[PDB]
Amino acid sequence: RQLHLAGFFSAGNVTHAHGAWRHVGATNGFLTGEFYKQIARTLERGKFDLLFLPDGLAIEDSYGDNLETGVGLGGQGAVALEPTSVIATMAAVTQRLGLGATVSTTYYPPYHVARVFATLDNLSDGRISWNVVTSLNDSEARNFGVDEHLEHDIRYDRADEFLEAVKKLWSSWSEDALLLDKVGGRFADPKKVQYVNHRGRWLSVRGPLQVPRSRQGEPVILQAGLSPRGRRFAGRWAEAVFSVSPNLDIMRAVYQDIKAHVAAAGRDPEQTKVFTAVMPVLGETEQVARERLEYLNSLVHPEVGLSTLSSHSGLNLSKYPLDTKFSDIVADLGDRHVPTMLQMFSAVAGGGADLTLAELGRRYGTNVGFVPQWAGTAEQIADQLISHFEAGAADGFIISPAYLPGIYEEFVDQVVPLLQQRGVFRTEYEGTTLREHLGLAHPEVG
Amino acid sequence: RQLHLAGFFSAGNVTHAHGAWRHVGATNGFLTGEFYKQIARTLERGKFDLLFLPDGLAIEDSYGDNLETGVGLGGQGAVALEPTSVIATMAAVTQRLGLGATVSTTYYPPYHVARVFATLDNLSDGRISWNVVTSLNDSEARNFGVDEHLEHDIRYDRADEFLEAVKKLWSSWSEDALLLDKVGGRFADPKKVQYVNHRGRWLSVRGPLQVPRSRQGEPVILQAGLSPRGRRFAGRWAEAVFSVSPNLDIMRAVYQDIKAHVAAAGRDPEQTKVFTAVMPVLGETEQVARERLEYLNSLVHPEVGLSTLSSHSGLNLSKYPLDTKFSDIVADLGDRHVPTMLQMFSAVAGGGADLTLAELGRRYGTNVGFVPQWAGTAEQIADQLISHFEAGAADGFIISPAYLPGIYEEFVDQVVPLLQQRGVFRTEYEGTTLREHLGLAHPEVG
Amino acid sequence: RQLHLAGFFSAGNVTHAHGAWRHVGATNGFLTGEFYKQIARTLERGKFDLLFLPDGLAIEDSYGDNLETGVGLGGQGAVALEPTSVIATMAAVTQRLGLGATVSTTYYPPYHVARVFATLDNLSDGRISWNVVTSLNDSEARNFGVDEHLEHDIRYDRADEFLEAVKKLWSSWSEDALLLDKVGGRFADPKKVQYVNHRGRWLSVRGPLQVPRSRQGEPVILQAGLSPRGRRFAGRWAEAVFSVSPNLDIMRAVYQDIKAHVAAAGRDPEQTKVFTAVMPVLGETEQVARERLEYLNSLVHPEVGLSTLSSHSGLNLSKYPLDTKFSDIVADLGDRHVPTMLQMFSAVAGGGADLTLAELGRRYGTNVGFVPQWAGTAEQIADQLISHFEAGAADGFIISPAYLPGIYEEFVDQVVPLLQQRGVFRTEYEGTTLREHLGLAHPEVG
Amino acid sequence: RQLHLAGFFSAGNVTHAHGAWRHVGATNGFLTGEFYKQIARTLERGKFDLLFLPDGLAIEDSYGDNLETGVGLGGQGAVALEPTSVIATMAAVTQRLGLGATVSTTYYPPYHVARVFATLDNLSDGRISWNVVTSLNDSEARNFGVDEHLEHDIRYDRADEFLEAVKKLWSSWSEDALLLDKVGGRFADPKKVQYVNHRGRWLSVRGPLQVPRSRQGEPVILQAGLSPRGRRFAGRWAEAVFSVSPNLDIMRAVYQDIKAHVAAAGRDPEQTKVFTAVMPVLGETEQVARERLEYLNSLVHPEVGLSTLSSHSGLNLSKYPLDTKFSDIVADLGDRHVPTMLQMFSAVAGGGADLTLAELGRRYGTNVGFVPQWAGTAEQIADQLISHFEAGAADGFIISPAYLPGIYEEFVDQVVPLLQQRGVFRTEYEGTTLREHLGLAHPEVG
C-alpha cells in the first residue's frame, strides 16, 4: 500500500506562508516561465502524483477596502497568473507529473471549461485535472462585471448541472470516432460524434465538443471545498479531495467523513483519493529545522495575515484597531454571529489565551491558521508522513511550500528517497496518466 | 529594409488547404504536444517573427444542419484545441519566436482576456500577441448558451470599448510598481498599482489586473477581419494586420488601404505591419513543384470545400443540388441578392466558365478561394517574395501551410536561407520581444 | 515479426550521397548542436531503434594528393566532428532512441574506449553502442603521429584482445556494488569492484573502470567490416552488423554468411541483428520520386565521386585525364591489376558501357557504388522494405540520407506510419534500453 | 569592475568536501544526465561565467594500495565519468554558460584534443574551454598501459610543444574558408585550409584539422597547476587560472605572482583571469550557517581524508596506525623526509596541536586542506566575496560545492541576486561566447 504526494502553490506571490516572498531563498520568479518549469521538473524528479494550482480572480481588497495591504505587503492574489497557461507550460517540460488547475463555474461557461481541459488533457497525454470551484467574492465579480447573486448552496446545485454538461461534452467523441482514413477520405465517424443538446435549468450548451478524448478518458475532478454542501458535492463528483487539518485526530475525522459522503453518493470510496496539507521545514539537524521555521514565521506581517483572515472568515476585521483583544470582538458582535472557524482558530492559536487582532493575524499568516508546520530532519518528516498515513490521516499529502522554488528541491532531494527506501512511495512511475498514478479507473463514454 | 514572416495554422485538422489531413506527409499530430513544439522550433529556427493560431468555437454546421460533412470529411473546426494552451506549450520550448492566439471579445470578458494575455506575455518574456475577433456565429453561440444578437458593425463598436478596457488593465501596474523589497517588507508600491474602474456603455471591470507588465509592455494586437468596419478597427487598434489577396495588384491595393486607415486614425502607418498570405509548394525543380501542387489540390473533397464556402459567403449552399450551376443560383437570387465574395470567387475560379456548386466548392477548398498557391523552386519562391515585397505588396508574409509539419520544414530549410543571403530577411534575431522583431515601439503605461 | 530501423550519417559534410551538401534542402547545419538535436528527436519520434555515426580522422587525401578536391568540392572527411560528443548531445534531448559512435581500436586504448562508452551509457540510461573499427589509413595515421603498420588481419587479432579488455573493464563493477549507504558511511562494496589486471600480448590495463554498469549492462557492440577476417570478428563480437548490398541476392547471401559466422562462434544467431543500407527518395507520386532522385544524383561533381572511388579501390585515378575510358585504364594496369570492386562497379554502373572516368566517378558518388537507391511513393518504399524483410534480406534497415535533415522528416512522417499500420514496425517503444529495442539479452557480469 | 564566477566539481562522487556524498541533501545523481543538466541550468540561471570539470583517470589507489578505502568509503576518483561527454550533455541544455574540461596531454595526442575541443566549441556555439594537465600518476599510467616516465618539468616542456601543435590545428581553417556555394559547387576555399605538418622533438601531426573555428575563434585555455614550472606554463599559455588559497594574504600573493608570470611572457596580465576557490555554506542566519558547516564537516571519514592527504603530499600515510601523532612521523622519517606542505598543513590545521593521522585526515578531507570554508548569511557571503575582490584576491571565484546539486541552487537563489544588486556581477549575459564573458579577445588565425 503506497501513499501519494501532491504539490500545491499559487502562480504568484503567496500560498499559505505569508512571509514566503520575503525569504532570503525565494527567487520570486513567479512571473517567469523558468520558475514554473523548474518546479514541475523537480516534482517529476520526485515522482509526485501531481502539482495543482489554486486561483483567485482579484487582488485581495476586503481588508482596508483598498490595495494598501494586498499590494504594499504582498497579500493574497496580489499577483496571480492565469493557471491554465501555467500548467500548459509545465506540461510542455514534463511527461508523467499530473497537473491540475482551479477554474470557477461562477465565471466560465461549461463549453469553455470542457474544451480547455480536454485540450490540456491531450497536450499532456492524459495528465490533467480540474479543481472545481463555485465561490462568489465581491472583488472577483467586479472584475467580471457580475451583479447577480446566488446563495452559497444554490451555487453548488448549479455546479451539479455544470458538471453534467462538462461530462457530456467530454463524451461527445467516442474513443473510436477519429479515423484519419486518408485513402478513403474518412476523417471520423459522424455516428460516433454526437451533439449534446444540454438544456437544463441553469445552463444551455449544444455541443459537440471540438476535442476528442485523451488516453485517460477524462480529466480528473478535484475538489477542495469542505462546507456541508461542498462535502456533498465532493461525494458526488470528486476523484480527489484536498483537505486542511491541524492534527491527526481531525485528519482522521475529515478522512472518514469524506469517504462516507462518497459511499452515500453511491460511489466506491477507494475511487476518491483524500490528500491532507502539511508544511514541512527541513534541517540537517532538528535544531536547524526549528531555527529555520522560526525565521520563516518571523517574516509574516500581522496585517497581511489579518487581510487573509478577513477574507476566510467573511468578517472585515479592518473595521477594528489591531490592538483589539478578541474578547471585545466577541462582545461587539455576539457569540452567535461570530463565524465558528474564527472562534476555533482563536482558541487554538493562543491556547485559550486572549490575543490582539494583530497577533491572531500574524499567526494566521504563518500557515493560514490550520496547516501543520512540521520542522525536523528529513528522517523525522518521513517518519511523520509515514506514521500519519498508516494511522489513516489521508491517502496522500499536499506539500505546502514554505518558499519557492527551494523547499521543493529540499523535499525531493532529502525526503522522497527516504519514503521510497521505506517502500511506501513509488520509486518510479508505473503508468503514464494521472489516473494511473492515483489508481483511478478509466471512465467509459456515456 | 527587411520583410517579416509569420506562420498561421489551425490547432486542428484544417487551415486553408482542405485536403491537408489526407496528404501522405501530414502527421495529423494536432492532438499532441510534440506536433506544436516541433513546428514552433522549426519556425524559430527559421527566425520567423511570429506564429499565430486562428480559432473557431464550433464544428462547422450550416452545410446540412448536421455533423456528417464536418466530422465525416474533416471540415472547418472538426478538431479545434483551445489556442492559448497551445501557444503556452510553444512558448515553453522557444525563446524568440512571437506567438499569437485568437480570443473572441464576443464570448469572453475583458478581465479574462487581459489576464490570460498578460500571463502569456510574462511566461514568454514579451513575445505574445492577441488576434482580436468579434464575430457572432450561430453554432458557436449555441455552444456558449448565447441567444442575444448584435449587428456586425456594432460588435466592433463594442470591441472598441473592450480594447479600451483591456488596455487600461494592462496599464494598471506601473513598470516600477513591483518592489520585492524583502528587508523592508515592501512588496509593491501601492501608489503605482491602481484600480481601473471602467464602467462603459457595454462593459464593467474594476481591476486592477493581477498581472504586471512583461518586458514588451503590452501584448501585440493582431487583426485579420478586413470588412469595411474591420478596416477601421484595424486602423485604430492593430499593430499587425493579416490579409489575403490573390495577386500583387490587389495586395498593393489592400496594403495602401490599411496604411491609409491607420494614418486616418491618427496613428503612424509604419507602426502597423501588414502581412499577406501565400501558400507555397516547393519542388527541387519547377516541374516537381507543379506536380506536388496538383497532388495537393486533388485531395480536396468538393463538399468540404462547399461547406467552408457557405460559411464564408453567408449562404447555405447545401440547399442546392451539387450539380446546380452558378447561373441557376445567380438567377434564383437575382444579381442583387448574391454576396460579393461569391461573384468575385466565381469569376476568378471559373475564369469565365459557369461551374457547378460541386466544382466551385472543390476549387474553393484548395485555397479558401483567394490564398495564392505559389508552386516553384526555392529560388523562384524567394524571388517572388522579394519581388512582391519590393513592389509594396506587404511588410511581410504569412505562410499558409499545405500540410504539417512538413511544409514548414521545407520552407525554413529551402527558402529562408535564400532570403537571408539576399539580405531581405534577418539572419538572427536582433531583439528578444515580438515588438522588437516587428520594429514596434514599447508602449508607455497609461 | 518486426523489422528494425537505424539512421546513419556522418557528423559532417557527406555520407553516401556526394551531392548532398548542394541539395536545395540541405541545411548544412553539421557544425551546430541544433542540427543534431533535430535529427535525433525526429528519429525518436519515428521510433527508430538506433542512430549511429561513422567517423574518419582525416580529410580524404588520396585523389590529386592534396586538399583541392576534398576541401574545394566537399569530399569525405572534409568536415568531421568528434562523434562521441555528438551522440552525447543527442542523448541529452532524447529518451528512447539508441545511439552509437565509431571509435577506432587503432588509435585509442581500451581504458579510454571503456570509460567513454560506459559514461555515455550511464548518461543515456542504457541507450549506447560502440561501432568497433580497426582500419589503418595513411592520412589518419599522420594526424596521430603513428608510424607502425600492422597488417589488416593482424589489426583484428589485436582487436580481439582489445574487446576482451573493454568487456573486462565493463565488468569491473558488479551491478550491486554501489551502495550509497549514507548513514553507515558505506559508499560501495569493495569486494564487488575488482582490478582487471589485463596483461596480454597486445595490451595492458589494470583497472578497475571508474564507471559502474548502466541499466543495459554493457553498450551494444556494432560491427561494419565485411572482409573475410572482419566477418570472423563479427561472428565473435558483433551484436549488430551493418552491411551495404546493391540488391536482394547479395543481401540474402551476406545475411546467411554473417549468421553462420555467429553460429560457428558458439553464439545465438538471433542475438546478432543484421541491418542493410538503403537510400530512399520519396515523392507523392512515383513520378515525383523519380524526378527528385534524378535531381539528387545530378548534384554529384565528377571529381568528388572519383576521389571517393580512388580511396575505396586503392587506385589513384587522379593520374588519368577525366575523359579517359575505363577500358583504357584496364589496358594501363592489365586486367590482373584492376581491383575487383572497381571492375565490378564499372560493369554494373555502366551495364556494359565503356564509361569515362568522370562518368564513373559521378555515378559512384551518387551512392558510393552499392547503396541501393529506392525512389517511390511512401506506400512503395514501405512495400519494398517489407518485401525484402520477408525475403530474408536483413533484420532491419539503415536509412542512408539523401540530404539532411529533411529526408528523415519525410521518411518518419510518411513511411513509418505505413510500416506501423502493417504491423511490421513498433508503434511505441516497448523497453527503455537499446538492448530491449534490438531484442538483445542483458549480459551478466563476468 | 565586475567579478567573475565559476562552478567546479567532479563528474562523480567527491570534489573537495569528502563527506559530500553522505549529506542528507546529496542526490548522488552523478551517473545520470539529469543531475548534470540541472546543475548547468542552475549556474546559467545564475549567470555564471563557466562550469569546469576536473578529471582523474584512476580510482585513488596509493592509500592501502587497494580499492578498500577509495571504493569502500568514496574516495577520490571512485566514480569519474569521462568529462567531455558530460559537458556536451550540459552544452545541449544551455546557451550562454561557459564549459570546460580537463584533458591530459600525457595520455592523448594533440590531434585528438584539438578535434574534441573544436567540436565542442562548435556544438556549443563558442562556449568551450580546455583545462590543460600534464601530471603522471602511477595508477592512471597503469590504466593506459604506460611505462615511460618523464620528469615533472619536462612534461611541461613537451606540453609547450603540445599546445603549439593544438593551436596550429585550430588555425588550419581560416574563418572565411567555408563557402557552401551550392549553385557554384564550391564547398570551401582550398587556399584557406592548410596542412599543419607539425614535426617537433616530441610530436608529429600533419593536419589539417577536420573542424573549422567556432564564433570565439579558439577554445579558452585553463590552467590550475601552480608549481614553479606550472606558473611559467600559465604565464605563456593560460587565459584563466584556477587557484586554491586558504586566506587573503595568500590569495593576493598568488594573484600578483601569476599576473607577473604572464607579463614576463610578453602578454597582457589583464588578459589572464585569476579565479580563487571558496566553499560557501549558507544559512538563514549566521547561526544556522555554522550548524550546517559543522554538520557537513562531521560527515568526513578520517581514512578518506587521510587517503587524499597521502596522495597530495606524496607521502603514503597508510603505512602508519591512524593514532600516530604527527611529531612521531617527523621523528620516524626525519624533518628532511616529511613533505613541506604536510608539515605546513599539520601546523595550520592543528593551530600548534600535535594531531594524530586520523584527525589530520579528517580535517584535510573537509576542504582538501586549503579551500576556505565560508559559513554565513547570503548577505555575509556576498560581503566577503566583494571585499576579497576589492582587496585584489582574484578576478573571480570558483564556488566549491559542499553538496550537489543543492548548494548551487542555494547559492544562485540567495547570493547571486545580492551581488547583482550591488553592481559587482552581471545581471545578464552581455555576449554569447566564453571569451566575451571573461573579457578575452578573439584570437587571430595564425
Author numbering:
A (entry chain D), B (entry chain C), C (entry chain A), D (entry chain B): 5 to 450
Q: What did the authors write?
A:
Then, DBT sulfone monooxygenase DszA catalyzes the oxidation of DBT sulfone into 2′-hydroxybiphenyl 2-sulfonic acid (HBPSi). BdsA is a DBT sulfone monooxygenase that shares a 79% sequence identity with DszA from Rhodococcus sp. The TIM-barrel structure confirms that BdsA belongs to the group C flavin-dependent monooxygenases.
The asymmetric unit contains four peptide chains, designated A, B, C, and D, which form two homodimers, AB and CD. The crystal structure of BdsA shows that there are four molecules in an asymmetric unit. The elution volume of BdsA indicated a molecular mass of ∼220 kDa, indicating that BdsA exists as a tetramer in the solution. Structure comparison showed that the two homodimers, AB and CD, have a high structural similarity. The root-mean-square deviation (RMSD) value for Cα is 0.165 Å. The dimer interface is extensive and consists predominantly of hydrophobic residues, which are derived from α1, IS1, IS2, α2, α3, IS3, and IS4.
